[PDB]
């Protein structure tokens, strides 16, 4: 029947396609006859899949002009060293803090190691360019990106999930590329699972600000596809509520004397399955523990 | 450590005691030197336990003057035929709709059958008086009950859980006896599980009205004890949110083609354990299915 989520590779709207894996998608925006943008930077191992899809839509790779990046996590920038060399005219648009992480050998080693863990036996990665050789340009909170005549996207700072996270708001289409700032959309239940890995105060304040946008028609997180209808319209509000709900559960359990590890293991059991293809199980469990440490400290 | 729930038989406050089983408690209010009230009507099988506790606090059973009843469900009035004969001066205070159910042989047979299922092998029920012989007086929405010099309780209609449900608000102590109108308090997670068995529109409207009470200090549902602190202060708001959350889950699952039975069985698995001592498992599962039918119809 009719559903409030579009989650299949191919055309999502007359200007928008989903490339690659719906679990870690790259979005393609048609900005004009011979101009395109990518949104979200994916995982390295998807390089040839995303390339194959891209070339179905884009006749000449020199026509890809922008690549918008929400945050520095390994699953949101892993394609950059592999596909940017094939995109001679692309400019990577990322926050200043995101750009800074790509200059840190420590940070990029973590990104590389996690991406390497996801390589399947059959596939061959193309040659990687250096992370500090990427064609990057820093974007600022509030900045207007005039990508094409019918694509004006505002950069909105949305820290909390991570210290660098931004979202991109298409004012014309009432479409928000929200990365991981709302959490992980639960494919079985239709609710947001919080992903607070840096700062709960910031995460909630970001959601407060995003709630004040004009009512959304389309909401596109970092994983799982495109949400529409009420799922888009109430996404930020719902994500805020789910974060407060997790805080309530944690506080109640702590009042009974539970260690953080009990709820962490429960969340890992309940939620880890959705991301097994792109997130090692032990890192998922560790992430749940970190989130609960943050909520406990700040709630 | 300090917890926001009191859940042990005995004194809860200087005017208030919990009698019987914390799972299906009867509350004792000291209205004066020689005047007392009971709140909530429990399950029949607890008659001698509640009697034993009552007589620890009350020197003379003729001093019990009122018995406040939230609703007609079998687990909220089962003690009445067994203990009212031992309470010569008691007046049972119930809504008109609640009183009407006790006049219906069909309705009381259901109450009797469910209560009989809960009798343990060891115990002996005292002789029951007829349901239409109970010393009942109907109370109205908005009615002020002047129970004693320091106990003024307002009757507030709170339909939705059932067609007859009311709650009792102690204006002085900012204490709400809320029956099942907020749902079932989850002992492991500290959130409300919705219990919508008649009408979702009414259930939500009741919670909207209860949210507008002065901030609560104490919130006393039909099961599980007394809540305080933020759990009391945000109870009605939280219960409203949890009902909307369940609607979201159901609607999402229905959009995927699920039958009501799938979520019903999941809820029965997740939630049925808490009430096994006083609610037959098949009735819990049936109740979950009924709730989901109502939410589907009205959401
Ligand atoms: C790697 As993640 C849980 O921030 O999408
Ligand atoms: C018997 As019931 C689930 O309304 O407390
Ligand atoms: Fe992330
Ligand atoms: Fe992510
Ligand atoms: Fe009930
Ligand atoms: Fe009940």
Curated annotation (Swiss-Prot), chains A, B:
Fe cation 1 binds at residues 71, 73, 161, 180. Pfam families: Lactamase_B. Disruption phenotype: Mutant is defective in pyocyanine and rhamnolipid production and fails to kill worms efficiently, but can still produce PQS. Deletion mutant produces increased levels of DHQ, resulting from intramolecular cyclization of 2-ABA-CoA. It catalyses: (2-aminobenzoyl)acetyl-CoA + H2O = (2-aminobenzoyl)acetate + CoA + H(+). Fe cation 2 binds at residues 75-76, 180, 223. One of its GO terms (molecular function) is hydrolase activity. This is 2-aminobenzoylacetyl-CoA thioesterase. It comes from Pseudomonas aeruginosa (strain ATCC 15692 / DSM 22644 / CIP 104116 / JCM 14847 / LMG 12228 / 1C / PRS 101 / PAO1).
